[PDB]
């Protein structure tokens, strides 16, 4: 769990925004302590109006594309895994399904040549993913299983680094913000993203005190 103490904006105590090391696949926790800044502003502490934003400082675009499928309940789904690797050079295609990132409510039998069958678990209707590995390069393949009636909509193809929609909390008794930071298994080692947090305080009458901070998530391998 990462823990940062924020600068108190008092005019006293290499690059600007501090560092967070992350490993592809982990989902960690982050705590930020606004005590140094909000305690002197004697009021009603923090409020749950934080806002996050992710930006790329260096990306190294992916080689293999991701893909989207659809199927009704219970019926087996088929797909191919060779038109998701536009290769510039000539090389062989060692398709692989990592057991660490296999499906969650189904099973996949990797074929010999870029083929696979996803037999969904009986009595299950939802969204299901698994992360393939075409020659070292990773992408995700998302399948949505419908309750036989109309059609399911299309999920957003999770980004390399993201912060879950609603898992954030603030303890006004102690001025501590908690949020979750999840890294997709597709993140390439060496990249860096920039997370900025805009947190609002509040005064004893209900006015506003804004605070902004930036962080630099460095996708490294071997933790």
Partner 1 sequence: NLDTLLPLQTIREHAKCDDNPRVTDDLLKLYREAAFEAAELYTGLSFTPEKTIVEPIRLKGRRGKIILSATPIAGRPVVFYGGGLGSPLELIPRPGSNVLFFSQLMATYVTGRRCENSVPAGIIIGILKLIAWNINNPGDEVMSVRNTLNANAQGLIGGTNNGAVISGAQDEWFRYRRVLL
Q: On the CB side of 24, how many CA atoms lie within 13 Å of its CA?
A: 19
Least separation in angstroms between CB 145 and a second copy: 13
DSSP codes of every residue in 15-76: -SSEEEEE-TT-EEEEEEETHHHHTTS-SS-B-S--EEEEEEEE----SSPPEEEEEESSS-
Q: Which are the contacts of 55, defined by CB distance < 8 A and separation ≥ 6?
A: 193, 194, 195, 196
Question: Contact letters (x/-) for partner 1, 13-32, by CB under 8 A?
Answer: x-----------------x-
Q: Is 42 in the site for partner 1 (CB under 8 A)?
A: yes
**Which is nearer to partner 1, 63 or 168 (by Cβ)?**
168
User: Taking CB under 8 A as the criterion, which residues in 73-92 touch partner 1?
Assistant: none
Tokens of 180: 């979750």
Report the residue from 23, 28, 39, 72 that binds partner 1 according to the rule CB under 8 A: 39
Contact pattern from residue 136 through residue 175 relative to partner 1, giving x for each residue in contact according to CB under 8 A and a dash for the rest: -------------------------------------xxx
User: DSSP E strands: which ranges in 111-219?
Assistant: 115-120, 127-134, 137-146, 161-162, 169-171, 176-183, 192-202, 208-219
Closest separation in Å from C-beta 162 to a second copy = 13
Asked if 10 touches partner 1 (CB under 8 A), the answer is: yes
* Cβ nearer to a second copy, comparing 52 with 162: 52
CB of 142 to a second copy, least distance (A): 14
Structure tokens at 76: 């087996």
Question: Which residues does 8 contact at the CB level (< 8 Å), separation at least 6?
Answer: 36, 37, 40
Q: Are 6 and 177 in contact (CB under 8 A)?
A: no
In this complex, which beta carbon is closest to a second copy, that of residue 151 or of residue 156?
Answer: 156
Q: Which is nearer to a second copy, 20 or 64 (CB)?
A: 20
What's the min distance (Å) between Cβ of 155 and partner 1?
34
Compare residues 39 and 180 and give the one whose CB is closer to partner 1: 39
Tell me how far the alpha carbon of residue 189 is from its chain's centroid. Answer: 15
The residues binding partner 1 (CB under 8 A) are 3, 5, 7-8, 10-13, 31, 33, 35-36, 39-40, 42-43, 173-175, 204
């Amino acid at each position: 769990m990462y823990f940062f103490s924020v600068d108190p904006r008092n005019g006293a105590s290499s690059c600007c925004c501090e560092s967070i090391s992350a490993r592809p696949g982990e989902v960690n926790g982050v705590m930020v302590s606004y005590a140094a800044w909000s305690a002197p502003l004697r009021g009603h502490g923090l409020t749950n109006k934080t806002t996050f934003e992710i930006d790329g400082v260096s990306v190294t675009p992916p080689k293999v594309s991701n893909a989207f499928g659809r199927t009704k309940v219970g019926v087996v789904f088929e797909g191919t895994l060779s038109d998701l690797f536009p290769n510039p050079e000539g090389e062989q295609v060692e398709y692989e399904i990592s057991e660490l990132n296999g499906p969650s409510n189904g099973v996949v039998e990797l074929g010999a040549n870029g083929a696979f069958t996803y037999t969904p678990g009986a009595l299950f209707t939802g969204v299901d993913r698994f992360w393939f590995s075409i020659n070292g390069n990773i992408g995700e393949y998302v399948i949505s299983v419908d309750p036989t009636t109309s059609e399911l909509p299309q999920p957003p193809f999770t980004t390399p680094v993201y912060v879950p929609a609603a898992r954030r909390s603030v303890d006004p008794r102690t001025h501590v913000l908690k949020f979750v930071l999840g890294v997709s298994p597709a993140a390439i080692p060496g990249d860096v993203y920039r997370l900025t947090v805009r947190q609002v305080a509040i005064d004893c009458d209900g006015n506003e005190f804004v605070h902004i901070s930036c962080y630099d998530i460095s996708i490294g391998s071997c933790g």
